[PDB]
Subunit: 354 residues, 4 copies
């Protein structure tokens, strides 16, 4: 692989409803967003069926739950502007029409919830800088003007809260290295300068918090293996060295914290099957990759159910959505085999970044 | 102290709003519930002022946030029945009037949020058994009938979720020992039998989850010192031995997880000042108790702000509410001295259990 | 129990030879020291048979291996002075006669090996202060003059190295609290002042190092339960609060680090059987006490074999030595039942401290 | 670098005497072994001066302390056989002449001390298999016959004890991967079959035990970066995945456990200076590499002094031995700059393996 490659992404965005039912959002062959949801918050639940939002879109959709429990979806429109639509009440399948937020977008949108309950959206703009826009009041359809954070992005952005409420954003830069920028005070428009974490990456960055309140960033490296870096202090400036894990991966990774507090990472492996690795003890060593049967055609997207059970979504060779899950709420649980969530076929609507 | 003693409780109940502003609920000399809230989600914020709910009450109020962000308060009425009132919209200071849930209550109410978004209330009933009632749909004013879980309670109940979504309830029994009972499947009316954790306790139990996804229970013991016990497996049946910490405490304890994932416990000490102890490392040893200046007249009530800073509320000798907080989002931060949230005086409306 | 009580001690001292064979030393009804040893360094080995050292003694013997592999035993004589005898070559059953070190001794002797290979002996003297004497060259029969460290002792002393090579000594003081004193530079006659760790203790202190390079002290408390305290920094001045464990014990405790690095403690329990507790995770919570069948008449003495297996020695009701051990090198191993090391009967020759 | 490369080795072997004084062994321009020792067991001690053993040698010397405290050195002779010489008494500078152990050696010797006090030597033989020979009685000049363990070696062997006393040997195989073989019972001639840990390595393996009683193996990888793997269970068959650390290294690594139980690794870096990395927390993430001033011409050799302070030895550009050490017994201590141990110049006498 080349240093500027961006690994294959997940085919859907997932969120938990206010009642923790999972709901997935993807783009079909009509270039519209469709969604489907669990009827009860358990992995063996039946799903409602695929439902369409009217409107042609030109990016992968991003979804986040508002602080009042209402889901809200963000997408690029045919005008290269940002659009959004929302549930009109928590746990209800009544939505707004797409509504405009304007701007000029050249990446998939990334959405974060500040610790004061306000959504904030991060995107690459027309000038390749990082731009953002935010709710001016918690869970309200009142938004700021667009503002630039500068830089030069060559991946989609990934945002996460630090334990103290400061948003930190990660993105590949012009030199193909991972860069980051952060709020210097929680949920405030006061930001640091851009800083490099060095090392080339060949996927979007994936960010998760550990139990200790430290962030941990996962990405594919230049040799096509998983690499990871973590915060070692109580600020955004002190990081470990990078470490790689053996094993060639062929998609973005997806990371989740299991209910014992240990991290697990899922990725498409060198044989185009889903692979999984997990921390064997706290902060500990990583297990050898374990494979699941079945060829897959996207990165995994990973979620947790109301009872803690992990569930994984992928694109199958039939271009439909498949999923599997843990059979029990237990880190050493067995897994189901792939099951189909049928009714539509999906396309990868990710913005082509070069 | 005698084995059947119940240590002095906190004077207010606290909750975070959907936007993480703190809001406190207490009972004044008119035997009504009054509340007050931060105007912004930071500990140095100004407070709005004390506001009254009409109606005479006969217990400490319990408050929990619904899964749609709306706060909801539960109290015993003059008819010894359960009443509740709620915010009509998240982050809004418009409330229902008290509305009846009936029953017959002989303890303070305890409220838990199931992982499927449904509130559930636990109380000691007229026959001294544990009773409960639940929302039948997430964040909806539709409730079940009352149902008994049996047992014999001699403290208020304390409920917490396990990491897998099963509610577990703790309460002192007829033999003054700590007993517990648990859901055997997440957010389902399928419960275990009562089991004893032995050891006498002389306060209500206080329950918190650690990073590992294990519960940890704190209580005052028969010798008036803090003692604690924790889950050691992935179920509700495997527990450690009890351990005590030196130092006589004269109130219920209050426990919180700081933003490095370590536990801290606050209690009124033998000299009637606020004492604090913290875990020095993961699962680690406990620090010597540290004292804050100022005589206090209740147990502490402890909360966290949107930026992770801990804030503590107590009753002062002037029978008003005082608070202090951490100056920075840092485990070794200094603390402010007590500041007054003036405007009313408070009474301890806790149900007298004998 | 009274605050000045000293719990029942172990009936033998144990050491590993240079080749790791265990060898035990006790006092028989003739008031002489006898010893016995494994013929091979495994717990299921046969033992050689009880062999006598000529000479009447008036304390429990203390044994330590020299830095050249030779065992050396220290005891009080009929003249209340200190005597010692040694193997003349490692792993050889040829010994010196008792040789005099003089002084005036009113406790059992305690022996430590400095990290520069020199033995050092600690005792309570005729004036109840702590006295010591040391080899002036590693593993050589050349000793210093006696020197006082002051204080007032009401238990036997217990000495251990810190991770940086500084000896630290623990002993009960005149107020029945645990006190300690330490070298301020490794293997140097430069010592701190005495400092109290507060808390009353009713056994000799038992000291072990954890993996982290921190000392951890175990003792029986005033309520007859096990209590423990540990270093929390990198010096001898920073300690945790004391914690107690539920369960009444009726002997001194004995502590050992198993081969997974976790601590285990053994003690005679309230029903006069051997009890065991272990840390369930690193630094972690302690298990409930587990009992072994059989009434025992001393504290346990605990050792490890060349393959890591723990072995425990006690006095039986027949006044003979019994032992049991782990069946495999595994923290969850089963244990054998008590087996007799027959041939003599033993007496408790511990110096009566009041 | 090529896959069959073997990175530059350390220029001396080091051991602690019975009294913990460091003593170093190297080969000078006369192809004889010379040694030098601290006069006192502290890093700022003066050194005695370089002293020669008569006899021409053809490998790097290996040294280990016997279980009776006597050092013993192993080397290949001009006849390609194994020779050894020993201190005739602990802490004494009187040695035997070289004495023959015969055989036919094609690697540097590796020496391990069994947990029953018997030395055992591992070497590549004339047929490229692993051969070994052992003392038949602890710390005695009585040796077994030579015996083969088979395999095909393309590095020097590295041996370490497991926590349960089983020797495990690591060596690169014919496929340039790391292979290992182990005793199936402690200090017994009963061995497993050879098993591969996969991954190519380009240095000798370096093995250390962590606090948990698990082995951890460090080596340079095919991309010239440090990689490491560790045991995850209680046996020799369960290992983690391999992880790499960023940063090109140009020598074998050297690993040590500091006195807080954390691991540190030293290696010559890409700029030919000494680099260091350390675990920032238990099992934790690894720090960025830190450089010391000064160009160096060998791998580091690392030892610990009687007070826990780490000391590092290297070859300088002047072909003499230099060292530096920690200024205090503290993981965050500063370090001294390089100081010369002058008097001879050293050559790399490592056996050329192809």
């Amino acid at each position: 692989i080349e240093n500027s490659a961006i690994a294959l992404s997940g085919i859907v965005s997932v969120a938990n409803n206010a009642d923790n039912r999972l709901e997935v959002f993807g783009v079909s062959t009509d270039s519209a967003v469709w969604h489907n949801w669990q009827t009860a918050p358990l992995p063996n639940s039946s799903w409602a069926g695929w439902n369409k939002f009217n409107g042609v879109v030109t990016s992968k959709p991003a979804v986040h739950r508002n602080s009042d429990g209402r889901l809200e979806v963000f997408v690029r429109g045919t005008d290269n502007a940002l659009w959004h639509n929302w549930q009109t009440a928590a746990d209800t399948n009544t939505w707004s029409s797409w509504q405009p937020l304007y701007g000029g977008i050249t990446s998939n949108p990334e959405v974060c919830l500040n610790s004061d309950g306000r959504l904030e959206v991060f995107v690459r703009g027309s000038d390749n800088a990082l731009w953002h826009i935010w709710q001016t009041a918690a869970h309200t359809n009142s938004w700021s003007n667009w503002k630039s954070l500068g830089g030069t992005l060559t991946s989609n952005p990934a945002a996460h809260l630090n334990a103290d409420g400061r948003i930190e954003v990660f993105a590949r830069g012009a030199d193909n290295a991972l860069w980051h920028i952060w709020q210097t005070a929680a949920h405030t428009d006061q930001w640091s300068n851009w800083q490099s974490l060095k090392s080339v990456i060949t996927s979007d960055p994936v960010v998760i918090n550990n139990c200790d309140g430290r962030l941990e960033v996962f990405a594919r490296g230049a040799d096509s293996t998983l690499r990871h870096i973590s915060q070692i202090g109580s600020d955004s400036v002190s990081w470990s060295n990078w470490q790689c894990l053996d094993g060639v991966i062929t998609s973005a990774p997806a990371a989740v914290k299991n209910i014992s507090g240990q991290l697990e990472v899922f990725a498409r492996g060198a044989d185009n099957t889903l692979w999984r690795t997990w921390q064997t003890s706290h902060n500990g060593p990583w297990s050898n990759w374990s494979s699941f049967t079945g060829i897959i055609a996207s990165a995994p997207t990973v979620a947790k159910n109301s009872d803690g059970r992990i569930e994984v979504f992928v694109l199958g060779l039939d271009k439909a959505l498949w999923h599997l899950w843990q059979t029990t709420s237990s880190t050493t649980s067995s897994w189901t085999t792939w099951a189909l969530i049928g009714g539509i076929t999906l396309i990868d609507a990710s913005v082509i970044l070069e």
